[PDB]
Ligand binder design. Structure first.
Ligand SMILES: [Zn+2]
Ligand SMILES: [Zn+2]
Ligand SMILES: [Zn+2]
Ligand SMILES: [Zn+2]
Ligand SMILES: [Zn+2]
Ligand SMILES: [Zn+2]
Lengths: 237, 246, 247, 246, 248, 241
């Protein structure tokens, strides 16, 4: 349990990213620990609500950078795409608490949560166009931001403030940094009073509407677009 | 015609919920009168625009749960498919513009009355909620939530049962305009009057352009999918207690 | 190139609507030239980003109708399907970032010029509308309204024909940024210049990611569906008066 | 009961088209009686299965064109949207199994009667066609063609106006079974009888499983889209001749 | 590892997964399904495997879910367990990024379809009989609604409404079965086909499979499967409201 | 013109693939000429129906085989995907007459036609899996053949007879080789009697149903999957296949 802390109390499972020395950059080991924590929470009948949070100044700087396309495709399809979709589908409510920087692969950790609470000084970005890739592997951008904002931030690599993403509906609530854990836990507690099958089916109502709208199919389509970026990058260098 | 009043003047059909003594709680009889009113307005060539409004402090407290031998899910499923789902979809598709005027509380089944309207004008005091998760059900029968609020707000308000102010739902696009409560009726009628000057077939097809876009996006199919999700909640409640809600 | 000016420098193709004396009303000749300019930009290896802008006070007043012995719906359908629908979709899909700079009035057909652009920057003074219901038609030929405004706002502005301010459309996400009118061109070019530092294939695939998400959501199919709904408007106007619109 | 006969026995509602003097061509009166018969069967708890059949040599020769000072597309659109599109979708969605027994010719509008049924049994002699391109229209109002035939056969039969045999439409899956003409009623009745033994809620939800799969695939949205395409045909015919069909 | 119900062999780049509960006509209890899921995972993760073959010992491919296999039984409980071992398992097998082939002999009833439909290709013995008679038990078809996609809607409704069986030749006509072969050659024909496919480059196979499966998901496959799962569960909900047990 | 012949008579535009010495293998010049021919037919108000046919033994052996992924992507998106979709959408009926072998890229020529008439001898295949690619650029396979048959023929590279593809609905009619041109022209002639706007909208009714079902979006999705095959082939060897 190096990289990920796990606590259960009052029917809330709190999963903490604990690699602040690297701004919670994600290596394969961290991702495997994180996927195990989600599974543990999903399987525990004493857990009603999942809280995903991070220690330190920044939620996550993204994937830790430190050969065939088939190899990249296979690895990214598991740890990036399959993991994030599995988290998305866990049949209990989940809430991310985001402070400071949430960059590129960071979005693959919070987007799968049902609700997001952000500190006022949180900054969200996906500057991977600079590295020759058309946005990260799990394309929540268009769904979360709308297409024009998604294009703007992909084309420029600029950051968005917490208030800006709250306006698009990607962030549910913006609170001062000193209230982020308070607000997240209070909301988790309110939700934890509710019947678990009703929570499950409320979640399913919304997620199935998104899937009818094309969410699953679109996420799969964009994964292949992303991979053409890797294929081009390899062909150049 | 106890529960629903109906007026036609100046090419506007005004349908009024008139059960203020129960905060416009909806029993089968009210819903049948309401559907007949919508049909009357739809079929009247002297009506260009439909206004739906409510008497009293509150638009609607929702379904009236005080309105057989061995109760089965088949029975609940059949009845709710007719008076909740089919009725609300039928209103949604009436080929003339419709405007809901919403004051005070609009709770759970109240949403099945205003969401089918094309436009919603809300009083500053309006409070929208769907707290049915408390009763073991994953939101009301007609799932406009994700479409009207976006998925994250939809989940938030279903998971918590909290209310949203008129200003909050205006931000999502669910409400077109927010006005002081003393101006709700006048602003709604003024807007209806502006729209009533337009060519009826253009109004019909403008409405169709937007609604068919939504159907291509998956609206019809999603509404049908979530109805079955809703009904699994009744099924579970019955398996726990013998009753369709906890 | 009578009505459209084309300039390339700094990795930017600037395409300018140059009919200010008619408030950039669009006749078929202007549209043919505009389509040629988009195609030229798409093929130009000196070009990373496209900027669409307009001379004068107004971005575009819409389609020029001042602009066949037995007139038929078949004829209207065929021409509108090419210069309105096919052109706008082709611009939409050009595999390079595009930015519309919109000042003053952008009415009805005007929207067919800016909606296909990836990003829209509007002057504080910009006013967007689609009042064609007055002419017996259910919104313009390319139905961006629902996608850009949300369904309730789309219905409201079609049913009433009212205008929306730059601020109003920025709240729906249809406009990316609102800036003072005297900064519109500078701000647009600065943003284009930022984007033009990026690798072209990454820009193309970022654009694709978003536009393909939209097509999976139903964008292409919905645009085609609404085109026919629009054409039933022309069909009705013709059945009433023998003319494509109510006059 | 001028045009439509109706019988309920062994939990089967049999709806019979009874206008052989016009080869079961459909005037508004016949369609109104037919819709009433479907509603009656839908609402009757003693009915588990619906059978639609026809008297005489032909299932239906289609819409009766022999059954307003300034005729407008608005008027045509409004009427066709009700008795053609809305009626057929309503029958499609009745929450009980339905079976069409089709003999002889089923032409154009005839398809609006059998396609909404869940299952089709055809006589060996049956001929299916939609030659409405001759009248300047892109196929009938309710576009099952692509769904039932596949897109290439749909285009071929629309573009040529040719008829398809029972065998040919059985190969596409549009017809479930082909039997000799003198066995059509007996085979249909036996099939209905087999289905009528099953629990009604399971029948309802098996039907929903398939029909909701179709709506997620785009059926409802596609049907609505093609109705507008159809109407552009009327709009063009009126622009050429002042009449809805060439 | 403990092996109980599933035989597993890897040779010549083919993983052959065998249902080995012929004493129960390969009726599927939760343990069998867990073991079968593990076998699919083993094959998926083995770089020496290019193709997966699913087959069954004895006369019958699978009689379906084992009926004889909590103080207060609730729909939540049934929903949770079926969502895992029926729906999630079958979707996971569907998505394994290597070609898979089912060899189907004799009866393949109801839950049996959840084992073969996830395979890419189906080879059936001339004697194979496919059915889903669960309407008799008050349920609108099994949990993973392949029926409409595999059979077309009219055939799907016919066989659900009647509970009748379809011959191998009948399902081959809809495209659900790729090839019908004599019973005594089913294993040889299947392995020969697996061998031919196992000569191809693995990434090209993966992306050919993806091309088709992603086309199906754009068409609505994932969303429709999820939708019908809830329809199926309303059947259980109703059966419990009538009798207290999840099937009539 | 070098590779494509074009004739208009009796309201039929006949477009002929005329590179028989190469079994109508498709180089970029041939494809540009083909696209020009489709455009000419589409724009000619005296043409009601388009017939696409081929000289020699074979309809088309596919793309003529005789560097970055960006370059391959750009070129294939134009001449293969954009061209084929443009042809698919021409607002007039079109009919392909397919004799002999139609392999891989050959499918990009006939699938965009509304109707396909095949000689009894015709053989259809897509063996590109052998070259490390997940089927050709325009993924009609699932739509035309169904998913199981599409997977089988992609995974094996086997050919399908005219009778087999007729059973799936991909071929409208199968006729003897010596009657292919006559049967196609007679069918075109029947269709050319019909009102052009009704033909247009009949075509639209079916094609829009397909696009509501997901056809446009799916074709775009699979194009990217195809390009990951080129991406991988280049990462192994340096060439696209
Ligand atoms: Zn990556
Ligand atoms: Zn309910
Ligand atoms: Zn127009
Ligand atoms: Zn008609
Ligand atoms: Zn079950
Ligand atoms: Zn290629």
């Amino acid at each position: 349990e190096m990289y990920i802390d796990y606590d259960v109390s009052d029917r809330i499972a709190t999963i903490t990213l604990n690699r602040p020395e690297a701004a919670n950059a994600q290596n394969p080991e961290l991702l495997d620990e994180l996927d195990a924590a989600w599974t543990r929470a999903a399987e525990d009948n004493d857990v009603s609500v999942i809280v995903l949070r991070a220690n330190g100044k920044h939620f996550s700087a993204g994937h830790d950078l430190r050969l065939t396309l088939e190899f990249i495709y296979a690895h990214e399809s598991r740890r990036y795409l399959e993991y994030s979709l599995r988290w998305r589908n866990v049949p209990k409510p989940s809430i991310a608490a985001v402070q400071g920087r949430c960059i590129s692969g960071g979005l693959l950790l919070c987007w799968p949560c049902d609700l997001i609470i952000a500190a006022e000084d949180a900054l969200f970005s996906d500057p991977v166009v600079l590295m020759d890739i058309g946005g990260v592997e799990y394309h929540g951008h268009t769904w979360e931001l709308g297409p024009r904002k998604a294009k703007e931030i992909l084309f420029t690599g600029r950051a968005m403030t917490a208030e800006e993403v709250a306006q698009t509906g990607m962030v549910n609530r913006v609170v001062p940094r000193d209230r982020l854990d308070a607000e997240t836990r209070a909301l988790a507690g309110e939700i934890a009073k509710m019947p678990p099958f009703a929570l499950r089916q409320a979640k399913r109502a919304v997620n199935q509407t998104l899937d009818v709208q094309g969410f699953y199919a679109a996420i799969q389509s964009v994964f292949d677009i992303h991979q053409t970026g890797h294929g081009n990058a390899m062909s150049v260098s």
